[PDB]
Design a protein around this ligand. Structure first.
Ligand code: F2H
Ligand code: ZN
Ligand code: ZN
Lengths: 78, 78
């Protein structure tokens, strides 16, 4: 619905930890919504979550890893 | 399926990192299977994938944060 649009996902990232090594925008571009606790983010499509972001993580890489069959990660939204 | 039994999940943990702060028995108890990569474990029921385990982590608690609607976590398998 709304969260197919990158910008709407990005908007969920109010209060996202300023010091995270992986930026809010990178995480939204990788299909994530911010959960509002920690650096825990959750894909709008597959509903699978990822936390504990470290310098050098690929936001798309870790997503594919946890949800290789995610519709977003495999291009179902274009 | 067969992974409803704890013992069947625990079997998947050979060569799981011996220095893991969270033990193999503890993660199997929390519904996890070992993926065979690093300290990455996946839930047999909700396919959530969690790694980077640290001291103080609850296997169950972390599993519920990443998949609050997990069938395993919510009692589905009785
Ligand atoms: O399974 C899920 N998500 C999932 C499952 C059970 C519970 C939940 C869950 O707690 N969902 C929700 C959490 C939080 C929220 S929120 O706080 O309100 O925003 C949710 C909100 C709305 C809906 C959900 S929902 O319950 O997912 O419906 C939320 C999520 N996603 C998913 C979607 C598409 C593909 C994959 C995936 O890559 N799976 C797999 C991944 C990996 C493996 S592996 O063992 O490595 O071969 C799979 C193996 C066999 C089958 C699969 S399969 O069929 O693709 O599910 C494997 C995974
Ligand atoms: Zn996804
Ligand atoms: Zn689960």
């Amino acid at each position: 619905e709304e969260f197919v649009e990158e910008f709407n996902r990005l908007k969920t990232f109010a209060n996202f930890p300023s010091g995270s090594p992986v930026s809010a925008s990178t995480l939204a571009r990788a299909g994530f919504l911010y959960t509002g606790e920690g650096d825990t983010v959750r894909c709008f499509s597959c509903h699978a979550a990822v936390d504990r972001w470290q310098y050098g993580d690929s936001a798309v890489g870790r997503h594919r890893k946890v949800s290789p069959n995610c519709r977003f990660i495999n291009g179902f939204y274009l």
